[PDB]
Amino acid sequence: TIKEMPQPKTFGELKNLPLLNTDKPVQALMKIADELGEIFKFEAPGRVTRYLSSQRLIKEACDESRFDKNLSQALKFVRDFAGDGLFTSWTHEKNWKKAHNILLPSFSQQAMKGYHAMMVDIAVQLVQKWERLNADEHIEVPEDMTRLTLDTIGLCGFNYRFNSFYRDQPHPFITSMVRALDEAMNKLQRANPDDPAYDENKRQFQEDIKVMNDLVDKIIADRKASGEQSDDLLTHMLNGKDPETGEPLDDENIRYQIITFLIEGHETTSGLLSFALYFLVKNPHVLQKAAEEAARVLVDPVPSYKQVKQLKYVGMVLNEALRLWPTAPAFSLYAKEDTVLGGEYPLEKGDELMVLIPQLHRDKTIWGDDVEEFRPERFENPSAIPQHAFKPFGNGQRACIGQQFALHEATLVLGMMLKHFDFEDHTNYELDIKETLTLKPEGFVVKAKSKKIPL
């Protein structure tokens, strides 16, 4: 048969929408998953999506023959400032492919290699920021993670120096960028968008959207007036030609990929670093195993692309951190054509599936009776993991492009951190995940005793 689809409390016209009225809608969703199963329908006025929690359905939607990346309502609100950079453009849309072809070359094994030196530059500034601290003082973890991640993509990707550690308040781009994500996320719970009480908010949006674009204007500016032969993301953006179309990328699009890269390729990573340092601190053995591994690979003052390549264990910490709290928490798909999802559910073409990744990772029939446990080891043999079971980086062609960049910077700095530093959970931090589309622990702070080792 057709089963009728499960689906939570409705409120007349408001449908399900009053359910999502919260700061933590993805958490609220996980909860409703938990209550409802492996697939439920969420309907709001105008839209309708099905959330998918279960590996069985997921792998079925992960099939490119049947389901293309769809722009979820979130994305569409991100799309007002990201237009059609890779993140927030349809698959069937000239600029997507173009920018893939044009822009991928910047993520290949050799590029990783040149990027390395400049990662280190950063990860050093950090280590040093933490080494210059006095007794009384703690580190505000996800704040400083964010200082790292952003300066890194800046220099790696664009050879601009945000100079985040030269500053004690978060960076103007960070601030207007956060308020933009927060906007996109509230616009999702709005009964009535055109209400006059949201006028102060639309103004605030344009204000921050500008700040962001300003910084691109500074970035492109200073690439003009430069002794370059940079081989980064920007030179490719600005000068590659899509071998499929012979064409290069329009100014308008370039300026969307700049914004895209400066957001998506730093926020998700610092999220990880912080969930990572979280579970470490809450699990003092795991910390120790990985802090030792580390002592004995990073034998050099300053690490090296291959040195990072051996942090076997610390890449395992990271996968797990990402397994528990996937910091880009969902992707979206439409039905390419009418189908039936696991033999039970009739989809019309156009239908919006939507993958709760943090629930996908908690499918107990895949991972064991103990999903909520932070066990890096479950990542001893990559082999054992069924396909479509650990998708923290999306699916098929529509997949994190920055992936191996990300793991590489996390693995890098995590590792250096693990090596110069004793980390004391001084306040018994209880985990608070802040949502702004992506996820990041909030108010997570720690103390760091050095092992006075220079660099």
Ligand X SMILES: CCCCCC/C=C\CCCCCCCC(=O)O
Among 119, 126, 188, 262, binds ligand X (CB under 6 A): 188
Please state the separation of Cα 360 from the chain's center in Å.
16
Binding to ligand X by CB under 6 A, coded x per residue (else -) over 414-453, reads -----------------------xx---------------
Residue 394 binds: one of ligand HEM, ligand X, none (C-beta under 5 to 8 A by kind): ligand HEM
DSSP letters along 344-355, please? TEEEPTT-EEEE
Under the binding rule (CB under 6 A), the answer on residue 394 touching ligand HEM is yes
Which of 74, 291, 433, 446 binds ligand X (CB under 6 A)? It is 74
Phi, psi at residue 204, to the nearest 5°? -50, -40
Binding mask 16-35 for ligand X (x = CB under 6 A): ---------xx---------
Is residue 205 within the footprint of ligand HEM (CB under 6 A)? no
Q: Report if residue 262 touches ligand X, rule: CB under 6 A.
A: no
- 8 Å CB contact between 118 and 156: yes
Q: How many residues comprise the chain?
A: 455
Taking CB under 6 A as the rule, does residue 86 contact ligand HEM?
Answer: yes
Fill in the per-residue mask, 134 to 173: x = in contact with ligand HEM (CB under 6 A), - = not in contact: -------------------x--------------------
Q: How is residue 1 annotated by DSSP?
A: -
DSSP character string of 103-168 = HGGGSSHHHHHHHHHHHHHHHHHHHHHHHT--TT--EEHHHHHHHHHHHHHIIIII-----GGG-S
Provide, rounded to whole angstroms, the least separation between the CB of residue 331 and ligand X. 7
- The interface region with ligand HEM, picked from 200-208, 248-256, 284-292, 327-335 by CB under 6 A, is 327-335
For residue 57, count CB atoms less than 10 angstroms from its CB and return exposed for 0-12, middle for 13-18, buried for 19 or more: buried
For residue 392, state whether it binds ligand X (rule: CB under 6 A). Answer: no
Question: Known binder of ligand: residue 400?
Answer: yes
Q: Which residues contact 131 (CB under 8 A, 6 or more apart)?
A: 420, 450
- d(Cα 419, Cα 403) in Å, to the nearest integer? 24
| Shortest Å, Cβ 311 to ligand HEM | 16
Cα separation, 370 vs 125, in Å, equals 38
Catalytic residues: 268, 393, 400
The residue to which tokens 């057709």 are assigned: 2
What single DSSP character describes residue 139? E
Decide: 24 and 435 in contact? Cβ < 8 Å: yes
CA 446 to the chain's CA centroid: 23
**Which residue lies nearer to ligand X by CB, 159 or 332?**
332
Site for ligand HEM in 431-450 (CB under 6 A): none
Single out the segment in contact with ligand X by CB under 6 A; choices: 229-237, 274-282, 326-334, 358-366: 326-334
Q: Which of 107, 238, 270 is nearest to 174 (CA)?
A: 270
Q: From CA 301, how far away is CA 225, in angstroms rounded?
A: 35
Q: Which residues are annotated as a binding site for (9Z)-hexadecenoate?
A: 51
Residues that bind ligand HEM (CB under 6 A): 69, 86-87, 153, 260-261, 264-265, 268-269, 272, 327-328, 331, 392-394, 398, 400-402, 405-406
Known binding-site residue numbers: 51, 400
Which positions make up the binding site for heme?
400
